[PDB]
DNA sequence: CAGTCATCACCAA
DNA sequence: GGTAGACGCGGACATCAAGCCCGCCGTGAAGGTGATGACTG
RNA sequence: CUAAGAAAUUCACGGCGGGCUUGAUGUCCGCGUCUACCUGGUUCACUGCCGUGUAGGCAG
């Protein structure tokens, strides 16, 4: 996934060069996802108790 | 899918801040709806952005 | 309810098979359970979200299903008109970030259990349902 | 010690959420101490109303998967955790780490009682399975049935009363029901045997077990070789640190009846051999046997050699 | 005037 | 609704040169212990 | 009487742009398949024949 820096950045180390250009630069992440197929609309969930 | 309930967070630490946020969002909703947002999303659906 | 009660007594056999169907939409995103992985990937070529899978299937943890089943407590003394929460000692809720049923307002599980066993001070019936629900839930206690 | 007449197969035991640490120096498959504790917990609830005994367990282990994850930049693992509830001030609790794994397991029991001639053995099989399906196999629950509701019933057969030809067909008919598993036995003679390879260095013993479950490589006089089995370090009992305490002495004990020691683990060795490699299936069974006075507590399997 | 309950700095490659 | 009885040999398989640049990799929560300090019934 | 007994990980996202794979070629060569015979299957267990009702001369 390509994204943007969209968090509260830390002004603890207040840099007028890095934390303003890193807003402009992207953010590359790797996640998981689970979809239904394009021809399925019903989710089935089964367990025992 | 268009879900709704768009001001209530799903994870929080405070309760006073949660009530303040929900009454702020209700202040937003009960004098103007989502109509200015909804017709802009309907524009971006209507053309093929 | 009579069958689950006759199973909780210890008298007859009980084994349920629960299936749930949920029409959502074509090709939509379903949400299986995400497992806590504390401090994984000190390299920045990492993986942020990791979903839980039993063998070639998306899955939900068992403790989450049990947490869904024991949302029984309506009797908590902070503000009872907000929905049933899960049965807990110091009866708390992690999404809300707040512990209802606080021992300064003497209605948690330790106070009521000690008054109702050691001192025979019986609480109200509604707090007694909470005290028994912590015994169906189970726990680990000490000195 | 006492060889049983009939063996009791508990065919499919798909169990979930078992413990996977099992000692301070191992991880993976749980300790067989859990299995012999499970069979004596069957003894205290079923074996007295059937007037039988159940001493040994055939640990077979068809499947295995652990709730672990491979991190980035590392070739090690970590464990997937649970999220514990909050403290009473609303803050988040600390983290205690419990490894966790699912299993699929077959079992082979050993009967010794008068109920085998007071009853049909199908009564023993049905009652033992219907009670053991309400217990916890290692640290986690025992699951009910599914699409696999066809191997649900048991079997039981003797070995003394019968012919001595087609018992090969009988035990290899049993082996048709535990065919994809790898049995687990006690192979502690090789821990003695790998001291002579280190007898040129020292008569020490604590680093010998840490030599066999890995890939040792030197260069040409690359050195890879066939390891002589599926040899793994298992835990094998408890050794006493502290003398035996009278049952009212130790503060915060589970019981006010039994005496208590403070102990710690001792480590042996095992192998994940297929059940074909051993002729008689009664060789595999694990037994508790420990002398009380000097505090050595230990489990192993006899009759393997 | 004495138990007890929330907070407080104490450390720490 | 018929058997019957067999299936070949030899020989060979291409050379040349080349493989991209640029920016970026998220945040929050996951501490026990005495020791007064405030409360204290 | 089982390192026994207990547990909610939550949430968000633009990978993107460009492009000549070229050129050449002999698959040659040979072969005896050989002999043998009786459907009126019932090409419907009966077609079509004086009464549509159970006895009959016909192309048999």
From Swiss-Prot, chain A:
Phenotype reported upon loss of the gene: Mutants lose phage DMS3 infection-dependent inhibition of biofilm formation while there is normal biofilm formation in the absence of phage infection. Decreased production of crRNA in the presence or absence of phage. Disruption of the entire Y.pestis-subtype CRISPR region disrupts crRNA production but does not alter phage resistance (possibly OLNs PA14_33350 to PA14_33310, and the flanking CRISPR loci), indicating this CRISPR is not involved in phage resistance.
Q: Which domain of life is it from?
A: Bacteria
Q: What does this protein do?
A: CRISPR (clustered regularly interspaced short palindromic repeat) is an adaptive immune system that provides protection against mobile genetic elements (viruses, transposable elements and conjugative plasmids). CRISPR clusters contain sequences complementary to antecedent mobile elements and target invading nucleic acids. CRISPR clusters are transcribed and processed into CRISPR RNA (crRNA). Cas3 and Cascade participate in CRISPR interference, the third stage of CRISPR immunity (Potential). Involved in crRNA production or stability.
Q: Which family does it belong to?
A: Belongs to the CRISPR-associated Csy3 family.
Quaternary organization? Part of the Csy ribonucleoprotein complex with a probable stoichiometry of Csy1(1),Csy2(1),Csy3(6),Cas6/Csy4(1)-crRNA(1). A Csy3(6),Cas6/Csy4(1)-crRNA(1) subcomplex is also formed.
- Note from the entry: In this bacteria, Y.pestis-subtype CRISPRs do not confer resistance to phage DMS3 or MP22, but instead are required for DMS3 infection-dependent inhibition of biofilm formation and possibly motility.
Q: What is this protein called?
A: CRISPR-associated protein Csy3
Q: Which residues of the full-length protein are shown here?
A: 49 to 97 of 342
UniProtKB/Swiss-Prot annotation, chain C:
What effect does gene inactivation have here? Mutants lose phage DMS3 infection-dependent inhibition of biofilm formation while there is normal biofilm formation in the absence of phage infection. Decreased production of crRNA in the presence or absence of phage. Disruption of the entire Y.pestis-subtype CRISPR region disrupts crRNA production but does not alter phage resistance (possibly OLNs PA14_33350 to PA14_33310, and the flanking CRISPR loci), indicating this CRISPR is not involved in phage resistance.
- Record's miscellaneous remark: In this bacteria, Y.pestis-subtype CRISPRs do not confer resistance to phage DMS3 or MP22, but instead are required for DMS3 infection-dependent inhibition of biofilm formation and possibly motility.
The protein's role, per its UniProt record: CRISPR (clustered regularly interspaced short palindromic repeat) is an adaptive immune system that provides protection against mobile genetic elements (viruses, transposable elements and conjugative plasmids). CRISPR clusters contain sequences complementary to antecedent mobile elements and target invading nucleic acids. CRISPR clusters are transcribed and processed into CRISPR RNA (crRNA). Cas3 and Cascade participate in CRISPR interference, the third stage of CRISPR immunity (Potential). Involved in crRNA production or stability.
Subunit structure as annotated in this protein's UniProt entry: Part of the Csy ribonucleoprotein complex with a probable stoichiometry of Csy1(1),Csy2(1),Csy3(6),Cas6/Csy4(1)-crRNA(1). A Csy3(6),Cas6/Csy4(1)-crRNA(1) subcomplex is also formed.
To which protein family does this belong?
Answer: Belongs to the CRISPR-associated Csy3 family.
What this protein is called in its record is CRISPR-associated protein Csy3
Give the residues of the full protein shown: 196 to 338 of 342
Swiss-Prot record, chain D:
Q: Which UniProt keywords apply?
A: Antiviral defense
Task: Please describe what happens when the gene is knocked out.
Answer: Mutants lose phage DMS3 infection-dependent inhibition of biofilm formation while there is normal biofilm formation in the absence of phage infection. Loss of production of crRNA in the presence or absence of phage. Disruption of the entire Y.pestis-subtype CRISPR region disrupts crRNA production but does not alter phage resistance (possibly OLNs PA14_33350 to PA14_33310, and the flanking CRISPR loci), indicating this CRISPR is not involved in phage resistance.
* Intrachain disulfide bonds: none
What biological process terms from GO does the record include?
A: defense response to virus
The name this protein carries in UniProt is CRISPR-associated protein Csy2
Determine the domain of life of the protein's source.
Bacteria
Into which family does the record put it? Answer: Belongs to the CRISPR-associated Csy2 family.
Please give the function described in this protein's UniProt entry.
Answer: CRISPR (clustered regularly interspaced short palindromic repeat) is an adaptive immune system that provides protection against mobile genetic elements (viruses, transposable elements and conjugative plasmids). CRISPR clusters contain sequences complementary to antecedent mobile elements and target invading nucleic acids. CRISPR clusters are transcribed and processed into CRISPR RNA (crRNA). Cas3 and Cascade participate in CRISPR interference, the third stage of CRISPR immunity (Potential). Absolutely required for crRNA production or stability.
Q: Which Pfam families match?
A: Cas_Csy2
Source organism per UniProt: Pseudomonas aeruginosa (strain UCBPP-PA14)
Other known facts: In this bacteria, Y.pestis-subtype CRISPRs do not confer resistance to phage DMS3 or MP22, but instead are required for DMS3 infection-dependent inhibition of biofilm formation and possibly motility.
Q: How does it assemble?
A: Interacts directly with Csy1; part of the Csy ribonucleoprotein complex with a probable stoichiometry of Csy1(1),Csy2(1),Csy3(6),Cas6/Csy4(1)-crRNA(1). A Csy3(6),Cas6/Csy4(1)-crRNA(1) subcomplex is also formed.
User: Which InterPro entries does this entry report, sorted A to Z?
Assistant: CRISPR-assoc_prot_Csy2
